[PDB]
Design an enzyme around this catalytic site. Structure first.
Site, mmCIF file in Angstrom:
data_model
loop_
_atom_site.group_PDB
_atom_site.id
_atom_site.type_symbol
_atom_site.label_atom_id
_atom_site.label_comp_id
_atom_site.label_asym_id
_atom_site.label_seq_id
_atom_site.Cartn_x
_atom_site.Cartn_y
_atom_site.Cartn_z
ATOM 1 N N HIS A 122 0.453 -1.781 12.277
ATOM 2 C CA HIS A 122 1.665 -2.370 12.847
ATOM 3 C C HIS A 122 2.129 -3.585 12.102
ATOM 4 O O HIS A 122 2.262 -4.715 12.607
ATOM 5 C CB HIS A 122 1.291 -2.676 14.388
ATOM 6 C CG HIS A 122 2.569 -2.845 15.132
ATOM 7 N ND1 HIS A 122 3.233 -3.925 15.701
ATOM 8 C CD2 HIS A 122 3.430 -1.816 15.305
ATOM 9 C CE1 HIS A 122 4.444 -3.565 16.151
ATOM 10 N NE2 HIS A 122 4.584 -2.281 15.932
ATOM 11 N N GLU A 156 12.599 1.049 8.088
ATOM 12 C CA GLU A 156 11.303 1.533 8.524
ATOM 13 C C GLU A 156 11.466 2.900 9.304
ATOM 14 O O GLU A 156 12.460 3.243 9.902
ATOM 15 C CB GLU A 156 10.606 0.590 9.457
ATOM 16 C CG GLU A 156 11.552 0.250 10.585
ATOM 17 C CD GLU A 156 10.761 -0.507 11.626
ATOM 18 O OE1 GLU A 156 10.095 0.219 12.338
ATOM 19 O OE2 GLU A 156 10.846 -1.710 11.557
ATOM 20 N N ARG A 200 3.603 3.259 10.122
ATOM 21 C CA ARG A 200 4.966 3.249 9.661
ATOM 22 C C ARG A 200 5.058 3.371 8.153
ATOM 23 O O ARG A 200 4.054 2.951 7.495
ATOM 24 C CB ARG A 200 5.662 1.818 9.916
ATOM 25 C CG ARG A 200 5.554 1.278 11.360
ATOM 26 C CD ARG A 200 6.673 2.015 12.101
ATOM 27 N NE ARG A 200 6.584 1.422 13.494
ATOM 28 C CZ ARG A 200 5.786 1.780 14.520
ATOM 29 N NH1 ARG A 200 4.900 2.790 14.379
ATOM 30 N NH2 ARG A 200 5.837 1.268 15.767
ATOM 31 N N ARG A 206 5.258 5.024 19.883
ATOM 32 C CA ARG A 206 5.494 5.149 18.430
ATOM 33 C C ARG A 206 4.209 4.804 17.680
ATOM 34 O O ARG A 206 3.843 5.115 16.534
ATOM 35 C CB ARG A 206 6.675 4.375 17.909
ATOM 36 C CG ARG A 206 8.012 4.999 17.958
ATOM 37 C CD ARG A 206 9.006 4.033 17.386
ATOM 38 N NE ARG A 206 8.622 3.816 15.979
ATOM 39 C CZ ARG A 206 9.326 2.993 15.204
ATOM 40 N NH1 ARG A 206 9.629 1.840 15.830
ATOM 41 N NH2 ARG A 206 9.761 3.205 13.954
#
Length: 96
Positions: free
Chosen positions: A85, A54, A69, A65
Site C-alpha cells: 500500500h 495508479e 497496486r 481493493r
C-alpha cells in the site's frame, strides 16, 4: 526511492492481469483504476502532476481493493509495483 527491479514473472499473476488491462486501456474492475497518483510522499521520482497513475492489483479473496497496486509513469515501460500500500515500490521488468 525505488527498491530495485523485479521480473514480471516474479510478481503475483494478478500483476500480469493489470498490465494487460493497462495495455488495452481497460476496462478495469475498480473505478479508482486510472486516477492520478500524486506521489505526495516523494517515494517516486519527482515529476509533474498527472505523470503517475495508479491501478489495482487484485488480492484474491480480498473484499476490498487490498494493498497491491501498479503505478505507471509516462515513460516507456515505467511501471512500479507496490504490495504494501505505497510503502515501497519496485520497477517492473516486463522482459522476464
Amino acid at each position: 526511492d525505488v527498491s530495485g527491479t523485479v521480473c514480471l514473472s516474479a510478481l503475483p499473476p494478478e500483476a500480469t492481469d493489470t498490465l494487460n488491462l493497462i495495455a488495452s486501456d481497460g476496462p478495469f474492475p475498480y473505478s479508482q483504476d486510472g486516477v492520478v497518483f500524486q506521489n505526495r510522499e516523494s517515494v517516486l521520482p519527482t515529476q509533474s502532476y498527472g505523470y503517475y497513475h495508479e491501478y489495482t492489483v487484485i488480492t484474491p479473496g480480498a473484499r476490498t481493493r487490498g494493498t497491491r497496486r501498479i503505478i505507471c509513469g509516462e515513460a516507456t515501460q515505467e511501471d512500479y509495483y507496490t504490495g504494501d500500500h505505497y510503502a515501497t515500490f519496485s520497477l517492473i521488468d516486463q522482459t522476464c
